[PDB]
Design an enzyme around this catalytic site. Structure first.
Site, PDB file in Angstrom:
ATOM      1  N   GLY C  10       0.792  -1.211   0.000  1.00 36.96           N
ATOM      2  CA  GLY C  10       0.000   0.000   0.000  1.00 36.96           C
ATOM      3  C   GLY C  10       0.832   1.271   0.000  1.00 36.96           C
ATOM      4  N   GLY C 137      -4.171  -1.662   1.649  1.00 36.46           N
ATOM      5  CA  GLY C 137      -3.534  -2.084   2.886  1.00 36.46           C
ATOM      6  C   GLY C 137      -4.311  -3.168   3.609  1.00 36.46           C
ATOM      7  CD  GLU C 245      15.752 -14.083  23.924  1.00 36.36           C
ATOM      8  OE1 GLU C 245      15.694 -14.010  25.170  1.00 36.36           O
ATOM      9  OE2 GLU C 245      16.772 -13.785  23.270  1.00 36.36           O
TER      10      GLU C 245
HETATM   11  N1  LIG Z   1       1.980   8.062   8.849  1.00 40.92           N
HETATM   12  C1  LIG Z   1       1.798   7.915   7.541  1.00 40.92           C
HETATM   13  N2  LIG Z   1       0.597   7.427   7.067  1.00 40.92           N
HETATM   14  C2  LIG Z   1       0.401   7.273   5.736  1.00 40.92           C
HETATM   15  C3  LIG Z   1       1.406   7.605   4.838  1.00 40.92           C
HETATM   16  N3  LIG Z   1       0.947   7.354   3.593  1.00 40.92           N
HETATM   17  C4  LIG Z   1      -0.314   6.873   3.681  1.00 40.92           C
HETATM   18  N4  LIG Z   1      -0.671   6.827   5.003  1.00 40.92           N
HETATM   19  C5  LIG Z   1      -1.957   6.350   5.542  1.00 40.92           C
HETATM   20  O1  LIG Z   1      -2.667   5.622   4.558  1.00 40.92           O
HETATM   21  C6  LIG Z   1      -4.052   5.825   4.742  1.00 40.92           C
HETATM   22  C7  LIG Z   1      -4.857   5.631   3.462  1.00 40.92           C
HETATM   23  O2  LIG Z   1      -4.374   4.584   2.648  1.00 40.92           O
HETATM   24  P1  LIG Z   1      -3.973   4.932   1.128  1.00 40.92           P
HETATM   25  O3  LIG Z   1      -3.010   6.100   1.121  1.00 40.92           O
HETATM   26  O4  LIG Z   1      -5.216   5.312   0.361  1.00 40.92           O
HETATM   27  O5  LIG Z   1      -3.267   3.620   0.503  1.00 40.92           O
HETATM   28  P2  LIG Z   1      -4.038   2.254   0.145  1.00 40.92           P
HETATM   29  O6  LIG Z   1      -3.780   1.195   1.180  1.00 40.92           O
HETATM   30  O7  LIG Z   1      -3.570   1.766  -1.208  1.00 40.92           O
HETATM   31  O8  LIG Z   1      -5.602   2.656   0.073  1.00 40.92           O
HETATM   32  P3  LIG Z   1      -6.486   2.532  -1.275  1.00 40.92           P
HETATM   33  O9  LIG Z   1      -5.731   3.098  -2.439  1.00 40.92           O
HETATM   34  O10 LIG Z   1      -7.771   3.295  -1.090  1.00 40.92           O
HETATM   35  O11 LIG Z   1      -6.805   1.085  -1.536  1.00 40.92           O
HETATM   36  C8  LIG Z   1      -4.174   7.245   5.266  1.00 40.92           C
HETATM   37  O12 LIG Z   1      -5.212   7.344   6.211  1.00 40.92           O
HETATM   38  C9  LIG Z   1      -2.841   7.526   5.928  1.00 40.92           C
HETATM   39  O13 LIG Z   1      -3.003   7.592   7.324  1.00 40.92           O
HETATM   40  C10 LIG Z   1       2.617   8.096   5.307  1.00 40.92           C
HETATM   41  O14 LIG Z   1       3.513   8.394   4.518  1.00 40.92           O
HETATM   42  N5  LIG Z   1       2.807   8.250   6.663  1.00 40.92           N
END
Ligand SMILES: Nc1nc2c(ncn2[C@@H]2O[C@H](COP(=O)(O)OP(=O)(O)OP(=O)(O)O)[C@@H](O)[C@H]2O)c(=O)[nH]1
Ligand SMILES: Nc1nc2c(ncn2[C@@H]2O[C@H](COP(=O)(O)OP(=O)(O)OP(=O)(O)O)[C@@H](O)[C@H]2O)c(=O)[nH]1
Ligand SMILES: Nc1nc2c(ncn2[C@@H]2O[C@H](COP(=O)(O)OP(=O)(O)O)[C@@H](O)[C@H]2O)c(=O)[nH]1
Ligand SMILES: [Mg+2]
Ligand SMILES: [Mg+2]
Lengths: 48, 427, 430, 430
Positions: C10, C137, C245
């Site tokens: 993701g 994800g 562990e």
């Molecule tokens: N902390 C952090 N969170 C991230 C980052 N990039 C994405 N996220 C998290 O990813 C979430 C959403 O998922 P997506 O960015 O759409 O990626 P995906 O899993 O492919 O989701 P879909 O494309 O809709 O299937 C957001 O709510 C963010 O919190 C990052 O660089 N840092």
């Protein structure tokens, strides 16, 4: 040997301290770069 | 990979599309002769979404132009970017528009649809992963209003999986420009409800209001009026074409904004807007953008959201910004005005960021919302149609083309049910 | 000779992955290309001549984030086959990610992972990175974990995923994907760590004096924790801790596996000059609810198991004194049936900073891994949020049209309810 | 080893310390940045390379005075987390600072003080400063002391507060703040010393040729007393005196704790060379009401306990002669049930002067602390003034609207009256 602990603290803590005080120096000019980039784009928008 | 095919119908659609292609061509950096001359390499990563390649570094957009009268294209061909479009894609008939829905749908629609379908099918095969189709038309006269519904129905029949999105212009409540608009809009709604997944509604009166309030433009024209609409279309697709911290395509937007299949009509907004002499005073940042987007003055649909309740809404940002700053804004605006939003759907406001901003603007954002304020627009046309249809003999103009009067009542029955559905989900 | 394999799924998983390899290359000491200007076999595979290749696989249905690495400075370090890209997003739809689009790319990734495992002769464990709100994800993550559970059997499949923030939400369908994903993790995941962006935002604003953070700063702080977790297998120390562990001590039962994480000292460059930061001070800062990267107060719940990892010039005598001092605090609650509760580990390799980074000059640093019943507070919020949606069936039509059966929603709801009952039962005392 | 922690509240508390830290950094010899070109623990904590940090927390609800320290020369010495500034001051309102505004920031400061005490393992007591007439000074200090009573229990909480002058006043609502602060102070404070502005104003010209002093000169005079009080903890001396030694001897009863303070010799830079300033001079001049720093004449009251602290060339033989001659003074009266009433302590380190200051290079000096019934004269003035305000309900509406319950005013009035009767009963002979 607490003296070697002191030397380890000089090498670990304080030698790296000199590194990222150079990096917060680097932080200084990148903010200056940020001002430059935003400024340069600003009279470009002024020109438009 | 996620290509998009563009279709323009009628007088209004072609003029909007002409400005629409001018904005994107400048954004990617395409010379009017059709050769790339841009400055940044990032412009050429994903030019395949909207542009095809000809031998010798010449780019041609996936544009299909449809009209019943020849005059509009003479303007399209004579335009600054007229040479960019493929000459064969100009598909047309040889008769007047007729200013009638029934005439466009039945008489000349059948003759034109077969040729248009073949022309579009050519471009449909020139793309590996065509995400969906994009339509620009008006609901007022009947050329775009009538033929667009037939074309949209056929496209759904051929390609059920693809995301069908349209940008429609509704008849204004006060600056209406036809004695018989209520019939055309009423008939068009029935096909629009069932066929198109995503529909964006824009009213001319709101655009006149927005230009006169914010832009302070003494003598507005359609070119200035269509400029704003061009920015809204460009901002929507920006996730596909450029990198971003949170990519959000159309199918992401459809899932979030639509709770139930029939509730898919949306209102869209754009920010920032500033008069050509007042931009000195403004510390344009993220909180300032949030203030403009949710301000009712910027909404180019002539329906106050405050009178209604809010369903799920989404905002797209362009440029470089802190992700925390964006998240706090959607948190604060959602909690501050909880009376506007429905209680049983928290996290109403979806966020998304794209890295590359449009030319000149340090940062720009786009707003798309779904709300029950659309019942006001449907109420206006229903009231006009009710008093209009009471004199049942004026239907005779549509009867000549084969339209039976019972079609009008059934169409009003369907949109009345849509109005009732919007009422029920208020609570 | 001691290998570890990492999977990134993701948008989120790739982005944090880019952050940690930034840290690994300098900490191992290699160029961005993979050529040298030890522990390397643990993290990197050796090809020939003097060049190295990481043991990483990047998977996403979105080609955009993968293409950025493909055109990035580190492109030549990454072997081209390790970068797998799809065609379209999962539309944040768990049904779309798990059934319609995921099955069309699941076999390609599984073959590559199996191929890469053959060279890792002395491998133990996996690392898989997820965002819960995202469809890829959650949808792709669950399908992959179901396959990997039966493919490899007794292998320590450790996970570290981003739990939704209590109020900050960017996805509206987020409660749906989070619960459905949680159902599959609790059945097939040996041990999965959690974070939330809102707590990271608060810590990086409060601890570090950084103006307005981005995802880049959060990823680096994420990158530091995993490095400290894997530091035992990379360098020598007085107390080396293996992945076996961690599995034995962190979890007292099977379904109560979910741990919490903390890191200290999170300090800026100028603040380090003004302090001295002995072992006691860094130990004290861990238990403060302020530094906890999940927005849950430990005072509401109790502690059953805790594990501490130390890097640098830590002396075993000071660790025992710091642990003894912590035990005297009445503000920290422990169950009667676990008086020991603590495992300590010490490693001699100091942390490493990033050029143009965020974190300070600390010679000695400590990593916190523990399990608490306070995590049930977040589960209640997600359960209540989900019930609001499902009461009016707010988004059923999108998922059902993608092949998923409506009867799956009540089953996931029941599984979450059983999990909360399990946590309450464990937290009870006799 | 053995440490003292300083806490400062309000505009008064901040700028009294600014003078104190100037004198104290110079008198131990450490640069403003914390480096050098012992007893450091007494008010420094030690950091990594050479940097020293003071064991102090500066608190004020108005950020103006705190920002002055942040931009002043001494910015390098203090750690930024020790300088806590509020948003809006208590507006000279006890109720506002006690309930509405004070309670927003109370938790943050209490964490800071507790964290500092960990480095102060040998902690022996707290020194706290207030302004009686101010809102933030008196109002916030009352809440702070109430929490510290249960937080630390049997710890010496000594205080240095500026009591309102008998006639000079710069606040109309000053009596209201004083009585409420008096009620809070008399219960929890172990031993609170008083000074007043008007006697500071008079002596600053009568003892040295300064025609129009400011707050700067007054702060230097106070810091000299504080330096002398803490000098026994800081240097070798012929008679060690600790904080508990002051606490036991100074107070004969619980509510009669309130001592008096004065200093001698205070002399201009030229006058000092014209006089011997022997031991007899410094002790004899101490008892004079002109040198008294609280404008109450001791001849009206009686002496019950006195303490002498010496710094210079003091010889024990001269101390015995001076004390014996003082006892021969018929102008000085003592309670019969306290025959001795004297404790003497000798320290070897001479007082340290500040360049561009107001004092002279005195070879030997002495500070005296005592408890007298002449303070009863001062209280009755505040009682009479408060009665005049509350007879017509002068400013009840302001304080009531900030959450305070009106029934507290008669309760505080009774508490002041009970203290008055207690002083008369103790002063009575038998
Ligand atoms: N902390 C952090 N969170 C991230 C980052 N990039 C994405 N996220 C998290 O990813 C979430 C959403 O998922 P997506 O960015 O759409 O990626 P995906 O899993 O492919 O989701 P879909 O494309 O809709 O299937 C957001 O709510 C963010 O919190 C990052 O660089 N840092
Ligand atoms: N001797 C002396 N007194 C001071 C000094 N600074 C402030 N004060 C005293 O502080 C008292 C009132 O202080 P204010 O700042 O007005 O009030 P506060 O205690 O800070 O509480 P607020 O009402 O919230 O401002 C006055 O009566 C002064 O005597 C100083 O430098 N020297
Ligand atoms: N904003 C805008 N509106 C237009 C433009 N051209 C035409 N219109 C509006 O479109 C409405 C109907 O146009 P019409 O020629 O009947 O299009 P048709 O519905 O396809 O037949 C008229 O009321 C016009 O005001 C344009 O360039 N910009
Ligand atoms: Mg994604
Ligand atoms: Mg003040």
């Amino acid at each position: 040997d607490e003296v070697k602990k002191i030397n380890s603290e000089m090498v670990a803590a304080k030698a790296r301290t000199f590194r990222d005080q150079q990096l917060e120096i680097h932080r200084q000019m990148k903010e200056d770069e940020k001002a430059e980039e935003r400024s340069i784009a600003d009279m470009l928008e002024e020109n438009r | 990979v996620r290509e998009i095919v563009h279709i323009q119908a009628g007088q209004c659609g072609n003029q909007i599309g002409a400005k629409f292609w001018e904005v994107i061509s400048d954004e990617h950096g395409i010379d009017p002769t059709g050769s790339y001359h841009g400055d940044s390499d990032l412009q050429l990563e994903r030019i395949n979404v909207y542009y095809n390649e000809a031998t010798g570094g010449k780019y041609v957009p996936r544009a299909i132009l449809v009209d019943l009268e020849p005059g509009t294209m003479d303007s399209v061909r004579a335009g600054q970017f007229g040479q960019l479009f493929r000459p064969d894609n100009f598909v047309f008939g040889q008769s007047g528009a007729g200013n009638n829905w029934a005439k466009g749908y039945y008489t000349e629609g059948q003759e034109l649809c077969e040729s248009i379908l073949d022309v579009i099918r050519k471009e449909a095969e020139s793309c590996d992963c065509l995400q969906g189709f994009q339509l620009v038309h008006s609901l007022g006269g009947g050329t775009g209003a009538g033929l667009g519904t037939l074309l949209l129905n056929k496209l759904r029949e051929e390609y059920p999986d693809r995301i069908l999105s349209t940008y429609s212009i509704v008849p204004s409540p006060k600056v209406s420009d036809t004695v018989v608009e209520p019939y055309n809009c009423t008939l068009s709604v029935h096909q629009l409800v069932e066929s198109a997944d995503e529909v964006f509604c824009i009213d001319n009166e709101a655009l006149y209001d927005i230009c006169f309030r914010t832009l302070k433009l003494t003598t507005p024209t359609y070119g200035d009026l269509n400029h704003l609409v061009s920015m809204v279309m460009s901002g929507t697709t920006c996730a596909l074409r450029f990198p971003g911290q949170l990519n959000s395509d159309l199918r992401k937007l459809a899932v979030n904004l639509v709770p139930f299949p029939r509730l898919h009509f949306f209102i869209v907004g754009f920010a920032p807007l500033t008069s050509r002499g007042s931009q000195q005073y403004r510390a344009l940042t993220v909180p300032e953008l949030t203030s403009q987007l949710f301000d009712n003055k910027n909404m180019m649909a002539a329906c106050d959201p405050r009178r209604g309740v809010y369903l799920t809404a989404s905002a797209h940002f362009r440029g470089r910004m802190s992700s925390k700053e964006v998240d706090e804004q959607m948190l604060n605006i959602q909690a501050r005005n909880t009376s506007y939003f429905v209680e049983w759907i928290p996290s109403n406001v979806k966020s998304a960021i794209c890295d590359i901003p449009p030319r000149g603007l340090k940062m720009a954002a786009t707003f798309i919302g779904n709300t029950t304020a659309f019942r006001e627009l449907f109420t206006r046309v229903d009231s006009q149609f009710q008093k209009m249809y009471a004199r049942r003999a004026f239907i005779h103009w549509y009867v000549n083309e084969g339209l039976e009067t019972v079609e009008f009542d059934e169409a009003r029955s369907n949109m009345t049910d849509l109005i009732q559905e919007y009422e029920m989900y208020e609570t | 000779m001691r290998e570890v394999i990492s999977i990134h799924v993701g948008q989120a998983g790739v982005q944090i992955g880019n952050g940690c390899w930034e840290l690994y290359c300098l900490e191992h000491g290699i160029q961005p290309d993979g050529q040298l200007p030890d522990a390397f076999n643990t993290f990197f595979s050796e090809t020939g001549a003097g060049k190295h290749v990481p043991r990483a696989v990047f998977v996403d249905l979105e080609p955009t984030v993968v293409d950025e690495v493909r055109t990035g400075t580190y492109r030549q370090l990454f072997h081209p086959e390790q970068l797998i890209s799809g065609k379209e997003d999962a539309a944040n739809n768990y049904a779309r990610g798990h059934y319609t689009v995921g099955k069309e790319i699941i076999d390609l990734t599984l073959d590559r992972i199996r191929k890469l495992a053959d060279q890792c002769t002395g491998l133990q464990g996996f690392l898989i990175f997820h965002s819960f709100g995202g469809g890829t994800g959650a949808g792709f993550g669950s399908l992959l974990l179901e396959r990997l559970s039966v493919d490899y059997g007794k292998k320590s499949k450790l996970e570290f995923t981003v739990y939704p923030s209590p109020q900050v939400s960017t996805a509206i369908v987020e409660p749906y994907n989070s619960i459905l994903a949680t159902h599959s993790m609790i059945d097939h995941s040996d041990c999965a760590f959690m974070v939330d962006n809102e707590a990271l935002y608060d810590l990086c604003r409060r601890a570090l004096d950084i103006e307005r953070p981005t995802y880049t700063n959060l990823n680096r702080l994420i990158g530091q924790v995993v490095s400290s977790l894997t530091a035992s297998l990379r360098f020598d120390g007085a107390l080396n801790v293996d992945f076996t562990e961690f599995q034995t001590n962190l979890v007292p039962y099977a379904r109560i596996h979910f741990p919490i994480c903390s890191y200290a000292p999170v300090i800026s460059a100028e603040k380090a000059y003004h302090e001295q930061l002995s072992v006691a001070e860094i130990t004290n800062s861990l238990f403060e609810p302020a530094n906890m990267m999940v927005k849950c107060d430990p005072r509401h719940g109790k502690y059953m198991a805790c594990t501490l990892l130390y890097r640098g010039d830590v002396v075993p005598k000071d660790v025992s004194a710091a642990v003894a001092t912590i035990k005297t605090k009445r503000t920290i609650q422990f169950v009667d049936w676990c008086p020991t509760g603590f495992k300590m580990g010490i490693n001699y390799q100091p942390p490493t900073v990033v050029p143009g980074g965020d974190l300070a000059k600390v010679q000695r640093a400590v990593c916190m891994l523990a399990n608490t019943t306070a995590i049930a507070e977040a589960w209640s919020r997600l359960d209540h949020k989900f019930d609001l949606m499902y009461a009016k069936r707010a988004f059923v039509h999108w998922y059902v049209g993608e092949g998923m059966e409506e009867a799956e929603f009540p089953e996931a709801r029941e599984d979450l309810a059983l999990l909360e009952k399990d946590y309450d039962e464990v937290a009870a005392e006799s």
